[PDB]
Amino acid sequence: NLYQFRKMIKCTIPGREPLLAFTDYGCYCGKGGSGTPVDELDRCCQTHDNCYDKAEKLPECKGILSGPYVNTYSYDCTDGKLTCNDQKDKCKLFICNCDRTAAMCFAKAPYIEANNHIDPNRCK
Amino acid sequence: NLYQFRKMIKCTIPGREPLLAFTDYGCYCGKGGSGTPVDELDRCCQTHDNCYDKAEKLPECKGILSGPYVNTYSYDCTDGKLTCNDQKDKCKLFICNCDRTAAMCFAKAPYIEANNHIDPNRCK
Amino acid sequence: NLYQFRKMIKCTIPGREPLLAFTDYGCYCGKGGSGTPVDELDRCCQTHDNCYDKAEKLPECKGILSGPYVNTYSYDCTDGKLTCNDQKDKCKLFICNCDRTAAMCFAKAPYIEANNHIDPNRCK
Amino acid sequence: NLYQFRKMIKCTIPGREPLLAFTDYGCYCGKGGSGTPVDELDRCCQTHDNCYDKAEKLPECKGILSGPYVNTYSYDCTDGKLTCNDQKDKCKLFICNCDRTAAMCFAKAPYIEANNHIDPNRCK
């Protein structure tokens, strides 16, 4: 779920607060999504977006709490390393990976403050 | 003049073709100009656009062939480093300084192939 | 095969010669590997390297010419768009996607001249 | 002094905690020196390392509390801009400039989280 995704970001990016840093970046990094990603970090959030859609369409995701936002999965954060544990619940595993990939991508991507709190027009 | 600017870029970033690499990139590099550069390279050609305006308004730039495109200044390209030799004619000097700064800004800047021939829009 | 990979790169990055631009960049783009990728474009190469290690293990990859270096696959480059066509031969399809993915981000990734023709030590 | 340098960074890049962000980054940021900077940020920390060395040799700096870490200069932070106020004491003024240049460079520079605590290896 989104609470767990925040936690994963806190694992690959220890001192930063996701709700502040990645909450209004580029075109896709937070609030809605339209236009072309201003950079790699934006692409991580874009990939994160459509990785959630795929999950919402995975014939393997059950009901009501099967969504990427509310579906709790099983994961581990050891020494800044994320590992998905779900095994038989192919849907939870999928959602856990969307978050694991995004959290790692965010860590390895260039954070360019010129691309933070952009102007809408840059996203048409 | 334009031929020399090309040479400078060719001096600073040898592994590129100036024409194909810098005249259809972003929203200020080559053609037009308008609305927030998509990246570093883009602002380089924005700075080089402002600089070409100043030059035209420089009192010391008067008469036919004093314009940035056609004005032939004096310069040197040694071991990858640019030097403007104009002292007397402070107009040519100013023009050469625009090109030099630009050619140096270009080399020193991350080039994103995808930023070539962008939409319109991103520049609204 | 590698000849086709080169072509794909010529599709997403026109007028640029892959054998000059991407053959000795970062720690992975070009001969050898080892170390940690200096940037994104380097990772695009690292990813490509391992995507090739995977295909050499894919149980669906047959005989002498099943390897990613010599396995001719089927694709299309129309208007700068890459598409893999194989279906029955899932191996070819896999190899074609390694090349399509890499060629695709080589274009989205920033090319930093400072991370080209690096120093060995910079890769341990 | 170092307290003011901290504040300067706070001035140009408020969304970050100076200590945690700029003291254990790359091959030069904060801890030790050596090797080739992993990136632009690492490289601002290299020139803000050299500059401190200059200041120490600067004949114009003499006596106890003239050193960059402890020398207290006069500066101002207004709407994200920094200006060094020292005129008479050109020792303080030089120390302030090193700080201004770095803190001001820390901002317009891409931050790569993954570059924190790099492998004392790519610093050879």
Side-chain angles (χ1 to χ4, degrees), chain C residues 60-67 70-71:
Chain C
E60 316 190 332
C61 290
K62 318 146 188 176
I64 308 302
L65 291 189
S66 60
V70 304
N71 197 343

Side-chain angles (χ1 to χ4, degrees), chain A residues 101-117:
Chain A
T101 297
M104 288 173 87
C105 188
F106 282 16
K108 301 178 187 155
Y111 192 104
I112 300 164
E113 307 227 337
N115 290 160
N116 185 28
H117 305 93

Side-chain angles (χ1 to χ4, degrees), chain A residues 33-50:
Chain A
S34 61
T36 302
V38 310
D39 63 51
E40 190 192 355
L41 187 280
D42 213 12
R43 310 168 181 164
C44 304
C45 337
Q46 178 182 65
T47 289
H48 187 267
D49 267 30
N50 57 45

Side-chain angles (χ1 to χ4, degrees), chain A residues 6-66:
Chain A
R6 171 165 166 298
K7 283 291 183 165
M8 289 194 160
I9 309 301
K10 258 195 161 196
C11 182
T12 71
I13 308 302
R16 222 152 165 49
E17 167 57 52
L19 298 173
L20 295 172
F22 308 100
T23 197
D24 183 357
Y25 186 105
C27 295
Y28 294 65
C29 231
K31 228 167 175 187
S34 61
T36 302
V38 310
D39 63 51
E40 190 192 355
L41 187 280
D42 213 12
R43 310 168 181 164
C44 304
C45 337
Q46 178 182 65
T47 289
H48 187 267
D49 267 30
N50 57 45
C51 186
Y52 263 30
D53 283 353
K54 284 180 168 176
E56 290 196 304
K57 283 185 171 179
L58 286 197
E60 292 154 311
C61 289
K62 300 146 195 172
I64 293 299
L65 288 197
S66 63

